[model samples]
Target chain A: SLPKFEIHDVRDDPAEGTMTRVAVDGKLLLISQYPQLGPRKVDPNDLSPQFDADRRISVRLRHVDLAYLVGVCKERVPRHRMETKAYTLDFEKSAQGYHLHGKVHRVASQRMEDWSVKFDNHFAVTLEHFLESALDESFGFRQHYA
Target chain B: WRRPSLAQQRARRAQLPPAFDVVHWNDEDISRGHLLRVLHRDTFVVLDYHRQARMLTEEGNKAERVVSVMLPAVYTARFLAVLEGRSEKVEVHSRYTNATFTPNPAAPYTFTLKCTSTRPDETFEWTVEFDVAESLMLQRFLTQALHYNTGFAR
Candidate 1:
């Protein structure tokens, strides 16, 4: 069986407005943030998700399985983005364990809202690596070299 | 006249040089140092050379032309040693570790590095096979190394 976990969208949080909190078994595990690009045009009550396509969503995973985390994220990124080589992906060491960051290229007219949905979905998939009993074999992680 | 048998064809292939492509290179000392640096990064450096000879009885006027290829870190080496001068035979053997392709499961791949004098105009060759991804990586690394060395964009 997998561990219990939950994700919360805390855009209204005073200190960290644009952050998502992930908790495992009712304990806070990590916080992911999406940087703001500009002021929102749509009303808060619009009930629609909006995001800045150019900005990156940075995730801080403390004491997590680096290989498995990257493996899962690699699978969840937009297929078209991966197919077209649309983004620069990287992993770096942090005070905790590791930081996974990506700058997915802006597809013209693509909603920040739509991209945010994908970002959430990306984390959701990554959680499965910890929960699932067996991992997919083709999940290899590589660093960008120039 | 009689046509050759399949056995003859196989023997002919065995006699032919290994297939390989040259990437970039410099002087002997620089080449050796570069090769060591490349190996230091857990990369593979392939050296291909052709030997040339003149008169049948003459040991003189012989020369060897060499070229180098750079590959990914999957193929690694601990050390490499090359001897100087013509008519001298040098051999290098290493355990090539690769997850992509392994001929022997129990042991890593054994590779050969050697310098020998042959016919100057002889064809060059490399023994290993490179996939599309591996080839692309090799091309990228070689481009960077060459660019750094000569300030020429690849």
Candidate 2:
């Protein structure tokens, strides 16, 4: 079954940077935020701050936010159909972070045809909102009238 | 107390000769000062059978002839298993030589090892016993391991 999913109330915070909330079937699933990046230390002798290398992207996620994903997977997928007893996927770039705690049950009998493809499709649709959709813009050009 | 001279130290080491079989060797008490480095796994050499004898000591006060004990990393797990009495024997080896290690049931923390090599012309052999304390082993290995794995700073 396809689950109704939406991302809303997206905004920027001065202290924490960009932030967004995700909901599935009108229930809150998770809150994602990109924390403000910090400055890198350079040698005192070298005077150029503009030439410094960019810092790696970092995202902080609470375990409470992940509980919904786990519940959804457990409810939809069968016990014996899971690829691994426990599954983990690094969805973000460069393995900076992971989305885990999702559990799936295996199907009971080999005689029956596999029932995992439909569940995978449903999960993918729900996950695409958080993974693929672009975040709200925080900056834009402003025109001035003299 | 005054430290023993080189001649005296060599004479002391000579008194306890290397045995033909690992089981026949007797255990000796080793103070931290006399104890050399116990490497769980050392694959850190590129030279071939040079037998360069140099002064390597725990305190660096005494100079003794020592050979590099380069063992594969797998031996660390095997050694631990042998110590737990799960395995009868484990062999730690490299391209040049090999050592057979078994736990000493009579002496709790001691290990009986027989190393042999026929490389670079003649047969070379040594049967000795050693003990490993976990704290020292972990501290020694992890400090160097971490620094080497992470790029060293200029």
Candidate 3:
């Protein structure tokens, strides 16, 4: 059985109106997402019950190096901004190398409301390595080539 | 045909020297201590001397020649993604990590880079592929930032 964890959207507003950091923690997930563009808009309350059931581990994080993720994954951002979201991690053991399958739904969030997002991300041991690397300081964190 | 002697072959080849030379460019050296670099720190640099050879065309010496370079955008994009701070890992020799092309009038004298990453387990595994057209803009950004071709733009 998969363990269940709750998501908490911890927002920080150092500036009077705008902010720049998003951090989340769950049963076995921790992430600090920085938006490449603007704010991340997630409304899980609007998801259909069936969709919600299938999405055993879905945390709508709205900030990070989205363009970098999408470019590396070679995935197209979903057209319907309100409906489609992306997969953060789906790992399958490999005999040769590592396999990571995920998508990044690009949502332009400029001139909107808040700009940071922190939520609980849930997962199982089978996916522990992947989630850890993704959320850890060393995983997606890359050389400052940009 | 008779196995020509080394000297004879050299003479014949000199008269009709092959046009392509597969050279190499170290990404680290070329990046020149820049903030960003490429995955294949060892890169293949292809050069075709046919264009320069065309100037040697003599009177009554008909010359037919074709020179070309093909680099799919995938190569440039994925590398650029790394430069742009994308997914941290990049795998080499994952799939067909090469791109090939023959010269044509309109399509002649062009370059591209192919990017691909294929997993090794599943019978129906997944991959990431990108061609030059889709990634040209991004590649240009990288090349320019690296100062590979200087004095072109900012």
Candidate 4:
């Protein structure tokens, strides 16, 4: 099952950054994000996360085939500064080595870090595309625009 | 309640004309080449009107020279990421156009945009520094573009 990708229409950002959505068949299952543009670039003192909010991605519970969970992805300058959101794809598949790298997608990142994740091999192929795209920066997903 | 004419059909389908607030423009670095605005049949929000530059050309190198720009809808947040400092020196490239957006390290609200694009046999490039007022106008335009592009107003 190939995933369809669609990027956000960025306006007012006379700057740089990108956000994309991924769907398989016809269901929107993932959101792959790059850090958004913000005032921090010019103001050296501005340590705020661009525009004062973290980059986030949401995944479908059905495809993730896992339970609800949370994890802090990363924070360099101040390791103490943090927030949360995470997901797991499958459990049966994990025991069977179907889970490639316990990673869920976001402008943030994730791994085991917990067990609230529920796993089932419900929608197999859809999760497959999401996993691969999650692993590689270039496992491209783009929705066509005319 | 009525069958409109072709013009009515087009108006009904198209987005409102892009706001080109810089109708009268002048500055130290950005001179001579005016920021032109014309019909947008090609897809982007900006096109130039030939005053001193040559008109439409078919000849490869012999036609009168030209300069232009096309601003497509791209994310505002992404642009800020690089414009600020979190991510600097990002590359922007299209099939026929490439551009550079550099933040003014010494100036808090200044940024530079230099781009080169090709059209028919006419190819040209330009560089400009956007200051406070102009930057706001540009930002607002993109914000509007972003909203409209995604049907976010709904």
Top lDDT prediction, candidate number: 4
Interface RMSD of the candidates, in order = 16.1, 20.6, 17.0, 14.4
Query: Worst ten-residue run, lDDT, model 3 chain B?
Result: B33-42
Instruction: Quote the lDDT for A26 in model 2.
Output: 18
Restricted to chain B, the TM-score per model reads: 0.22, 0.46, 0.20, 0.57
Clashing residue pairs in candidate 2, if any? A78-A105, A78-A106, A79-A105, A79-A106, A80-A105, A80-A106, A80-A107, A81-A106, A81-A107
DockQ order, best first, reads: 4, 2, 1, 3
Angstrom error at residue B66, model 4: 4.6
What TM-scores do the predictions have? 0.23, 0.31, 0.20, 0.40
- The sequence of per-residue lDDT tens digits that candidate 3 reaches over residues A1-146 is 22223322233331222222222321122222322222233567744221112212233432133222322333322211221233344333333222433443223422222222322123223233343333322111122111
Stronger candidate by DockQ (1 vs 4): 4
Task: Considering the two chains of model 3, state its CAPRI-style docking category.
Answer: incorrect
lDDT value, candidate 2, whole model: 0.35
Model 3 over residues B76-152: C-alpha lDDT tens digits? 44555553445343334424232322122232122333332223532221211222222322343345333422323
For every prediction, compared with the true complex, DockQ reads 0.01, 0.02, 0.01, 0.04
Total clashes, candidate 4? 25
Docking class of 1: incorrect
RMSD of model 1 against the true structure: 20.2
For model 1, the stretches where C-alpha displacement exceeds 4 angstroms are A1-6, A13-84, A107-128, A131-134, A137-146, B1-154
